[PDB]
Write a protein that binds this ligand. Structure first.
Ligand code: CL
Ligand code: CL
Ligand code: CL
Ligand code: CL
Ligand code: CL
Ligand code: CL
Ligand code: MG
Ligand code: MG
Ligand code: MG
Ligand code: MG
Ligand code: MG
Ligand code: MG
Lengths: 323, 323, 323, 323, 323, 323
């Protein structure tokens, strides 16, 4: 294409740990974890009567605890709720350590614009060097119906998470569990020569995951898979993780500490894909040494979109090496 | 999201029985059936030379027969055909009992607008209390390509049906049967350690069903699955029904009387989902008793989109209770 | 619908053979092959340092070799690269035999517009009777995100090919092979009564193929599946071909000569679908004999969209008969 | 531009006479007039209680009177009113003489689509050779805000009329007269060296007329100016007519018989513009004699848009010659 | 049209007085003025170093002074500036008396959305009965280029003001004065028979005013003209006011107390237009007495858009009567 | 607004001289002129049979003559014509001195995209430091109807010229002269107390000029007025120039050498506007010295859009100083 997209800021994002702001002990324990990204939650996991205190707890946690080089985020309240403006104002004013805001229930691009206006103004007032990035949750049918447009809604936007349980609720999917599969979401084969019919299970989230993936990959964002509720089923977690990784997802939520190592292992890039990326970068250097505008590797032209992907993958591999 | 959608009129729609207008005996028998919704057909099931008479038959049937509290609909002829304007004019003028119009082959939002103009004018002339609702058939590749836009095309719009057989024809899918699965729409696994390769069947309608579902659920409509042709295969019907129900579909067509009970059973909401909805409504009442703007259930904020879903589900459960 | 689309020029397109322009011997051998469509490649298969010569080779091959009635195409370089304008100018100026241009990596409708401007001007200068047609490659996440818009981007546009390997690269799908399936892109079933869990493989390209199919079928284009890399696995090729054919795809690439017969066999229309189309055409003639505007077959109205599909299928069947 | 628009059907349209359907005597007298275009009105000039009879009157007038080669139109009731569907159905069914429908108060493109659906179906039923054309009234702020989109809303669309009095009402312009100027819509000059300030009158309809003109001329339609109410002021009529003619308008309404000759005289094309158009057509013939793709006149390339304008102007000049 | 727009909340808005928040004495004096609408300014008239205090001053003024039944507004800082979020949060939290927010420099619809999100959340927190309305300033070329889209950007939106001086700056118009005319923005006539050429002055703001007017009147908003700087020139003020009133503008800014009476006098509706509106309302009552859906006045159908305009004008006339 | 536009490359553009490529003597004489910008024409002024030679002439002129620091442009042939691709390829390949391309008859944004693709590829091949800029001619009703969209069509786009004579032809305006005014484009005043009626001339190009101006000023481009044909009427030229300058236009075409000094004089910025811009830049420096994010001048906040305008004006003033 003649149309070129710039990749978002290239962070390592294999594991995304959710931590309720209402639990300072859990926040403290999380600061020493192996998660790549942590969000401190003001939204779904925090009861209304606890939201004001959780906000205070999070300010203290972001300012006092040692988070290392983790990408630190908050999940703000919904735009449809009165809590949100104080989440953004109080925390962004008080907490230089904050890296990102996770905006829930995003439905249309203007939702993201709204948060960009507010965030920008606070950063202007505080004379901030760091600029906050955004992650959006696609966790409703409305957001899914507008996902491609949402993907281009802010220069801050870096990533989208698939909120599977809230998406199920929004679509009225038959789901009593967070994530997972369903014996009813299956095909019954036509009778074979023996008179037999098999039941082959299908993926209830295939459509959602692929559509969000395409939006992310078209427009330079990280595609992240959401929560998996069955803490007693690491095999099921790992299957779900490997399935979305196979599509191109870059990471997955952890909502129980056991899930952190599982996500980290699955979403580590292969040695081979890192090596290919490194060879692309050396082929770029070669083209510059030769005075040649076109980059070639193993007899193939490597185009600018492909160079940009290679640069992003290397930044991620390099982060792993220094963790 | 800050963007809020109003749910369509909340009807019970588990089973949708198709009845040709060319058969007054079948229409009479259908009036005593257990279908939730009936459409009297002027379109696909009626030969051109029979369309004028079928129109007359339907006027007589809507005016004379006892349909109970069924949602009564007509499937009008295609907008590309000369029959349609007389279908709408003659029946809407003559038949106060009519509840809805099923518009076939919808391709773009302006198709729906056109029917809204005509329907509105006739209702104005007749000084009608009741306002007719619309259901649209997504049964062509054109309609599927525009489904999200179609979903917002009229305040009358309540529901979309996936016309699987006509959709197959439009896409040139290999299909000689109405609905069902296909041994060729399958994956051949890579050889395992024993040298073996399995054939795992896939869902040829997954993309179509999910895209239409997302449009419906984003914009407040009922997602309805279309016909299944093999009357000798209730197990296959039930599998197809349970599979789309698992996604969030609300009902399915019956094109043979045996299919009515099968659809009714599958698309009845679970006791648990009705109970959750009832508890949401009591949590709303609680918030009002306490003077609190935010509704809480089991320690979780229940947002306005979720309240609106609960209200719709209850209206549907209540209808079942009075049938 | 009241909105009507005109079908593209109706070519037989079961097999699409890729031939590198850097290999004149391979080009010569390809001219005697059984492929329906051949593209002479200047892009992915040709190293940068060989592109200028490949352009010359292709001019000689198009002018000198006997291609029969094959649809002859070139795959031009990417719009993001300096080679492209000379590909179009030099070949279109010199080579009346050329039938079509395959535009790679298409991202937005204006990419196609750009090639239409250039192609048109050269045809105006050369006073050409024949008008070149376009095929577009949807082989990036950007193109997939804009596929519906791309489908309406030029009166020359006839077909879209799904570039599976480049699409995988763009989406960061885990893929070291061109096409095929993936043991990780699978679901792990919930434990049954015996404590057992099965692994049911899913289709990593279902979303992509279906979305591109819908765009094509909505807007009158041929949907074509891209390359399959495992030349040692005809069973896998045939499975992949039959799977997309079941959806409605019309043909598939051959990147090794063995794949030509496999594609030709799979994408031949059934005797039954050709017979139905022929009966539609005779029903049209019947309606004209009777003075009737509506066409009827076996008691069903056959609408204009359906007539147009029948006419296209017959043109394709007729081509097979004369090959 | 590479984007090319097809001109509408090229009718002579200098004068457009409005005749109320409630007055059969006036309709009879109008049939012998010198108007180019006549619309028989069911809308603004006909009281509600007279609309049903006016419809009958118009059917009789269109079928019985001798209208010559006039372009014969009806102004249907508003889409927001119950009268309209019977206007279209009854008259189009009964009256082959009808040439066009004037759609009032058009606000959005889908308004035009709606009338195209209904009109098409009736024409299909009646097996009509002639296809009815459309004229739209831009007579509200809504329509003006959407005029460019309305201009591309139907293949039937030929012309737009600026409904000045209804537009004034919609905008709350201070206007007690149909059309004309306003001493208050003026500028007061800054004091000159003598201390004097002049009042220079401005054109209250400049914006409206120019915006509608641009939409028409971009998209191949006739721009027509609406009514002027002061029958005692032919000088004012002629000034208003010459002012919009200077912009490129092609005709103007007559709402009193005296205005017909005034419009005909003003909107006759100059001898010079007809001669230039004729020379363009002979230059086209010259290019064909020489085997040259580019047309040249007096040393200037004459492009396809300019040829199409010349062809339209000649068709209009030829009509005048045969009147 | 079949598309119907709801009118904004119908306030009397002849005069709009600008009062800097940095001047508590001027605010006090303004509370006893005859202005219909007052905005307390935090933006253009307040130096950066005074903005924090002006915010405090305005809170005190809104809470303590007697504003009568005036529509009370604040002009917040620009969205591009850090002051704005504290303007909205502090004042909306503290000041139930506030009626509206005037949003400056609006460029795109999402600017308005952003303020709607923030305003809504604060109102939710405060459990407000009253809902704040919005006025937007169209005072840049960007806003003018997007004015039609801005007009539909919020259910709160009631009015647009043409910020002539800031618009001039944005367009680089030659303007050293706020508003007014320009000897250079004139036409030099062609020589007449005496050899003479006149200079006829044109309206430099005609395009801007008319485009904004059309957006407002299409979408149910009040069109308001902005400031006029020459306090020594009431004749020029009155000319400018009468000129935009003639188009349909509903009011004008006062930036000096002398301008209040001038705006009030010019933008009072005529006795005749109020009488017509009253007769429309009595014709509506008549139609209801007769059981007739169509409203008729003096032999003309009065449509719903026209009824809605009449209702709005009466609400405004009634307000004047009670002032 | 929160939406921010980047200004185009800031060139001095008071005078734009048109020089036919068919006249090498005129090209030589033009190189020593006082024009700011020169376009060497391949389009309107060059007969078809002379276009191939004019292309060669221009290559020689751009490579051999001394153009000083003039902005050097070519007016390429229309996209609808076969000449264009060779204009771009041959000249851009051969002529590093070229600064810009003037694209004629632009109708839609994709026209500009097309030229951006071709231009970019040639620049890539030639390994150019300089990047060519674009100017577009808005000289048709189609382009005027799409002008706002065209304004955002390429990062190369710097300027739009109003092609008055071609625009008149496209709109069918009564115009036998290039530019100028029209006694018929006038208002006839209502009789005064003496029985008199005046004729006040209006501006036939007001709508066009203002709409194009708004598009330019919204999106960071230079608005340039087109040709004036009456070389014997410098007073009329100067009036036309001062009239568009008053709106904010930045320059005007010269099509006769006498017009160069007239344009240069009119479009020189005032001493006062340059001084204000310089004071803005010193206020920016002041804010940086004080550590303050907001810039203040004379008690007013100077926003980023206003800073960017000031920077552009200064770059232009500085250019004048070094000419
Ligand atoms: Cl979730
Ligand atoms: Cl079907
Ligand atoms: Cl590929
Ligand atoms: Cl009117
Ligand atoms: Cl202002
Ligand atoms: Cl011109
Ligand atoms: Mg959630
Ligand atoms: Mg059907
Ligand atoms: Mg490729
Ligand atoms: Mg009217
Ligand atoms: Mg301002
Ligand atoms: Mg021109």
């Amino acid at each position: 294409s003649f149309t070129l997209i710039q990749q978002a800021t290239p962070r390592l994002h294999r594991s995304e740990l959710a931590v309720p702001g209402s639990n300072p002990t859990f926040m403290e324990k999380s600061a020493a974890s192996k998660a790549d990204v942590i969000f401190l939650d003001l939204e779904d996991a925090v009861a209304p009567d606890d939201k004001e205190q959780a906000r205070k707890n999070i300010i203290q946690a972001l300012n006092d605890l040692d988070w290392g080089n983790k990408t630190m985020m908050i999940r703000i309240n919904g735009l449809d709720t009165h809590y949100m403006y104080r989440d953004v104002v109080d925390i962004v004013e008080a907490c230089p350590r904050l890296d990102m805001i996770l905006i829930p229930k995003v439905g249309v691009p203007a939702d993201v614009y709204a948060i960009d206006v507010l965030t920008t103004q606070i950063e202007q007032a505080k004379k901030r060097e760091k600029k906050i990035g955004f992650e959006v949750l696609i966790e409703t049918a409305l957001g899914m119906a507008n996902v491609e447009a949402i993907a281009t809604s802010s220069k801050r936007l870096e990533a989208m998470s698939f909120g599977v349980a809230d998406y199920a609720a929004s679509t009225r999917a038959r789901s009593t569990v967070i994530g997972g599969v369903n014996a009813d979401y299956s095909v019954l084969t036509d009778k074979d020569e023996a008179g037999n019919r098999q039941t082959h299970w299908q993926d209830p989230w295939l459509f959602a995951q692929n559509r969000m993936l395409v939006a992310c990959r078209a427009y330079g964002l990280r595609p992240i898979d959401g929560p998996f509720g069955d803490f007693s089923d690491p095999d099921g977690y790992t299957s779900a993780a490997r399935r979305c990784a196979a599509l191109g997802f870059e990471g997955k939520w952890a909502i129980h500490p056991s899930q952190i190592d599982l996500a980290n292992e699955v979403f580590t890039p292969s040695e081979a894909e890192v090596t290919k990326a490194r060879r692309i970068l050396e082929a770029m250097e070669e083209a510059a040494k030769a005075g040649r505008g076109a980059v070639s590797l193993d007899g193939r032209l490597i185009d600018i979109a492909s160079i940009r992907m290679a640069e992003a993958l290397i930044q991620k591999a390099d982060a792993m090496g220094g963790k």
